[PDB]
């Protein structure tokens, strides 16, 4: 459809904030998954995790 630039920048900031919240929730999910994988010895979730942070982007969040 497109102050319009300001609206676009605000939309981008809101999208980035939603992305940040999603990433935080995903890191919390990964921690809970790690707990479950350690309880149930599920190697599948460990392989999924190793796939997810091959570049280590999620590695720092998991450490945190």
């Amino acid at each position: 459809l497109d102050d319009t630039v300001q609206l676009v920048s605000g939309f981008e900031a809101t999208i980035n904030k939603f992305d940040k919240n999603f990433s935080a929730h995903l890191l919390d999910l990964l921690a809970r998954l790690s707990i479950y994988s350690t309880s149930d010895c599920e190697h599948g979730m460990a392989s999924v995790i190793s796939r997810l942070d091959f570049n280590g982007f999620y590695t720092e969040r998991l450490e945190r």
Binding site: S47, R51, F54, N55, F57
Partner: protein
Amino acid sequence: MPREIITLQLGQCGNQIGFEFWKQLCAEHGISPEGIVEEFATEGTDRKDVFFYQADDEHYIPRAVLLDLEPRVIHSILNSPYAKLYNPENIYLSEHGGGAGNNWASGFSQGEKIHEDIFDIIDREADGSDSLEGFVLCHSIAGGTGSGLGSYLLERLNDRYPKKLVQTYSVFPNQDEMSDVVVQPYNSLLTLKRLTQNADCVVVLDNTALNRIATDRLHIQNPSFSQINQLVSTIMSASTTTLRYPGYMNNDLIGLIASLIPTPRLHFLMTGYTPLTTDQSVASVRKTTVLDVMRRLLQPKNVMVSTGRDRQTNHCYIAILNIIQGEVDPTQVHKSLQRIRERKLANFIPWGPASIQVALSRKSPYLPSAHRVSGLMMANHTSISSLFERTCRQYDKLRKREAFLEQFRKEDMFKDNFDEMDTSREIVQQLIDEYHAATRPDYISWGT
């Protein structure tokens, strides 16, 4: 309904690639050269409607458009057994038949001259498509027709079909060989300009890489255009296997390409094939494991791109998609992914999560496969910039020497200036740097 794909084969190299692709697809799907399904083609498991159209309830005709500005190549395609595969109403041929003379600007002018015919053909093919996603152009970037006419067609598709996807099969000029086509840098510049502004995806086919692979991997001392076209047809067959072998995943082009293009600018795709074997080595079906398959695919001798050895830039993969076709054990895939991460066989972007996606696929049932397991790699790798950097260096070398620019000034697109070539060279340099930047954590701010 399937998302039908129209294949446009442009210029000598592009038309050869398209013709060989259609031949290979017909062989894999059991489609006769006339577009009729062969009696042996009983495996109705292929999605022809993505790449082929049905002429009747039994005959599948390839959704392939053979486009040339010179009538010789179009006539040579029409002299093949597959002449009946393509819809003639989707075929636009430049009336002048003179080609572009290996001039991108001439190719663009010819596209402008055949604009009406081309858009009539495009609309005719579009009505035959139930859920057309977009157009796929097969062309050379070094010639005139596949480069210039291809760029014109891409621009007009972007303007007219802004909601449709634009994938290209773009044959890039040999960057390791000194091109005899003094205007090849102009053709390449026009193609890179259009890829930056009007194309959504450019699949780079480096004739230098084709020759290098033929020599070192295929043991072909002098790769012929026909042999390069046959290699391209093998690559296209592997790329279309998911249409020819329908499955649970990656059943659509957007699903396939989403993993490779994280941002709209990072739309330059590299290809990989596995297992790579020399023609003499067909005899021994090696029981290659997923780890072994990936290891052979990870060998530069098996990589379908001849990137120069850049010593200054720590080139890395931005993204990897591995499409594996054939009999695949999930435990072998899991061990392969574990070993790949553990062995760091691929370096990923430092600014975001990146991985090698792995798809397991069935082979085409109509074509007997000598290999139990085959694999395609799709990768965004910063070393591909070295091919792009080399092309940029050749462009700059010609522009700084004004080589063959008088021939471009004869054509209206380049008559007044070559500013489009200089902007293309600058864009390609920025692209190379971004691909190198994409190996670094600061890629998050790259291009800002």
